[PDB]
Design a protein around this ligand. Structure first.
Ligand SMILES: Nc1ncnc2c1ncn2[C@@H]1O[C@H](COP(=O)(O)OP(=O)(O)O)[C@@H](O)[C@H]1O
Ligand SMILES: CSc1nsc(SC)c1CO
Ligand SMILES: [Cl-]
Ligand SMILES: [Cl-]
Ligand SMILES: [Mg+2]
Ligand SMILES: [Mg+2]
Length: 265
């Protein structure tokens, strides 16, 4: 169906490890979208064909206001192209670098939108496993949308692929190569809530080896300005044992969330 000739390409929207993402417009309809370009040589060399297929399969079937749409794909012997919904206000990562820290209302609103999207995912036994600020995009009304489903799977799971970059958002069971389930995304939700309020993630460290140590031991502390309600939510989410982490309904119902968020369940 679709080919490169059907699109006019515009400015770079971002770069990932494999992803080179561009603004584009479809010629006949003038429909604006994001084109995610991957190089087949790099996909083959790293052996991550299966991840890309999972990304297309999982993300194209999901339909939720807080999850980014994937419309389709095509390829041309050197490259693969994913056709994505365009997120005009950019990444949460960028917003955090701009403002340094988010206030309690902004943070609780983002956490509510995340928990809604994740609740929808988990009801189909889909786990994302790569929730972090560079994979959270912002819609035209500033609403949060989860993206980059390349690491997503069905539960329960092991890990068959090498961990690439940062350990900062991964729970103990994942970095220790053990078995995991849905609760991995709840740990990440805890890490994000802390990073939003404080400006850096709770286990951050100068080396891989030391970050690993802080995560496995769950060593983190709070700055004085973090309030009692935020501390209670974060401490419940960052439990070493997965089964002790709250259910998403509990997060959505938590008193600090209900007091500060400006969106509903
Ligand atoms: N739909 C989109 N709208 C706007 N920017 C995007 C979109 N998709 C990706 N980006 C930008 O490109 C970056 C990489 O996209 P991503 O899908 O996360 O690639 P990778 O799989 O390589 O991480 C994002 O971190 C973001 O900065
Ligand atoms: C989802 S289409 C897809 N995934 S991986 C690869 S490797 C070339 C392709 C193209 O056939
Ligand atoms: Cl497995
Ligand atoms: Cl894997
Ligand atoms: Mg990404
Ligand atoms: Mg990816």
């Amino acid at each position: 169906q679709w080919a490169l000739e059907d699109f006019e390409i515009g400015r770079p929207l971002g770069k990932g490890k494999f992803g080179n993402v561009y603004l584009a417009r479809e010629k006949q309809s003038k429909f604006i979208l994001a084109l995610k370009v991957l190089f087949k040589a790099q996909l083959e060399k790293a052996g991550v064909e299966h991840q890309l297929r999972r990304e297309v399969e999982i993300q194209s079937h999901l339909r939720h206001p807080n999850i980014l749409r994937l419309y389709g794909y095509f390829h041309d012997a050197t490259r693969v192209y994913l056709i994505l919904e365009y997120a005009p206000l950019g990444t949460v990562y960028r917003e955090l670098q701009k403002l340094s820290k988010f206030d309690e209302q902004r943070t609780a609103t983002y956490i509510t939108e995340l928990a809604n999207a994740l609740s929808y995912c988990h009801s189909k036994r889909v786990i994302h496993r790569d929730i972090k600020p560079e994979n959270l995009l912002l819609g035209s009304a500033g609403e949060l949308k989860i993206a980059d489903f390349g690491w997503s799977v069905h539960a329960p799971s092991s890990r068959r692929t090498t961990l690439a970059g940062t350990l900062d958002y991964l729970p103990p069971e994942m970095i220790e190569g053990r078995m995991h389930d849905e609760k991995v995304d709840l740990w990440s939700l805890g890490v994000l809530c802390y990073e939003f309020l404080v400006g850096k993630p709770p286990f951050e460290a100068n080396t891989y080896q030391e970050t690993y140590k802080r995560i496995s031991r769950v060593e983190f502390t709070f700055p004085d300005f973090v309030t009692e309600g935020a501390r209670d939510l974060i401490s419940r989410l960052l439990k070493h044992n997965p089964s002790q982490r709250p259910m998403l309904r509990e997060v959505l119902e938590h008193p600090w969330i209900t007091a500060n968020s400006s969106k509903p369940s």
